[PDB]
């Protein structure tokens, strides 16, 4: 199917700062990937983003009733919907399960990678740190970064490049809004 | 900002495909099944706490359809440029032999929002237990999508996620096998 495609998108966005103390509403219209006209609650009128959107900005700005609908949206739309979903979105908290296992940076070689696998947490903000015998190790640390699972949970792998010596105890430490104190998992060689 | 809630809509010609969904900080709260005219909550618990009149989504999509016609004309029928996807396959938890896990196929950074996705087990299409999300919006106004496959890890099976998109010259296969 080589037929040309044409795509319309609309995004009605509500931006929240300090709960609902400060709210910004954006009414955004897109043709393909390009935004061509928008209503910003900071402005209170539509503005063309590209020349293509100018007729719409001018037509919509001539409709006082339409503009007042958009101007009230921070209250009637944004603050309202925030209230509706707050208990299971804003307040959603799921602790991570933390696993440590050894790995290899290159096949055949002995174990020289410690993986701290952090799974199933929400929200996304998280801090994972490695310790060797109680001392934070900041060198040789690489990660997958923050991975969205698409199902309201996240995961991340935080790896430490190291050559384990007998007696050493390694610790992966995880801080997260769902936790009241750091979660630690030890690994011994 | 602390949080962002986005009501994201699209309509695509000539496919006559339209989507309506709500996003909270990058996760889907719900979308509307246009054919069934029903609200589909991303997690079932969501629907115990909130409701949505699906009909309102239908009205918006009709407006989006009419607007697309107008804009297509205004642009002198300038079509979308295909942007092929990036594809990643991962598991949802650390893998242990014969311990139930889930394969995730993440399809990212693409447009238009049309894709064929197939799970392959040992080179064969599998559909038992699979699930998927609708098209999820990106801040660069491309799209994201997830496909899922519950599976029982073994040394004998390999998997691939096969993705077809008009921006690809050939289908993209991303492999997974037990480490």
């Amino acid at each position: 199917d080589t037929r040309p495609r044409f795509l319309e998108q609309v995004k009605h966005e509500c931006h929240f700062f300090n709960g609902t103390e400060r709210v910004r509403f954006l009414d955004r219209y897109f043709y393909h990937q390009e935004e061509y006209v928008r209503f910003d609650s900071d402005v209170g009128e539509y503005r063309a983003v590209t020349e293509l959107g100018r007729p719409d900005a001018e037509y919509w700005n001539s409709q006082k009733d339409l503009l007042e609908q958009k101007r009230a949206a921070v209250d009637t739309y944004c603050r309202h919907n925030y209230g509706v979903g707050e208990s299971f979105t804003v307040q959603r908290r799921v602790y991570p399960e933390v696993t440590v296992y050894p790995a290899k940076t290159q096949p055949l070689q002995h174990h020289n990678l410690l993986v701290c696998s952090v799974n199933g947490f929400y929200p996304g903000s998280i801090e994972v740190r490695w310790f060797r015998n109680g001392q934070e190790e900041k060198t040789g640390v690489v990660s997958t970064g923050l991975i969205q699972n698409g199902d309201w949970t996240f995961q991340t792998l935080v790896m430490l490049e190291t050559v384990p010596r007998s007696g050493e105890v390694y610790t992966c430490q995880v801080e997260h809004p769902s936790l009241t104190s750091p979660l630690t998992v030890e690994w011994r060689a | 900002e602390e949080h962002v809630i986005i009501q994201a809509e699209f309509y695509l010609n000539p496919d006559q495909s339209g989507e309506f969904m709500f996003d909270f900080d990058g996760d889907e709260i719900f979308h509307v099944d246009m054919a069934k005219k029903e609200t589909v909550w991303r997690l079932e618990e969501f629907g115990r706490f909130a409701s949505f009149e699906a009909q309102g989504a239908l009205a918006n999509i009709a407006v989006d359809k009419a607007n697309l016609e107008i804009m297509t004309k205004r642009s002198n029928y300038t079509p979308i440029t295909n942007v092929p996807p990036e594809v990643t396959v991962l598991t949802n938890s650390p893998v242990e032999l014969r311990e139930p896990n889930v394969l995730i196929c993440f399809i990212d950074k693409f447009t238009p929002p049309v894709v064929n996705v197939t799970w392959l087990r040992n080179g064969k299409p599998v559909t038992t237990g699979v699930s998927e999300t609708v098209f999820l919006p990106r801040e660069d106004h491309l799209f994201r999508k997830f496909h899922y496959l519950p599976f029982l890890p073994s040394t004998e099976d390999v998997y691939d996620c096969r993705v077809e998109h008009w921006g690809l010259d050939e289908p993209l296969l991303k492999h997974w096998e037990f480490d």
């Binding site: 719409d56 739309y77 919907n81 | 009501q7 409701s51 949505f52 407006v63 009419a66 107008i70």
Partner: peptide, 13 residues
């Protein structure tokens, strides 16, 4: 509570 729909503005023909 009930989620509210923001509507989409109609372009001129």
């Amino acid at each position: 509570g009930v989620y509210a729909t923001r509507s989409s503005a109609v372009r001129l023909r």
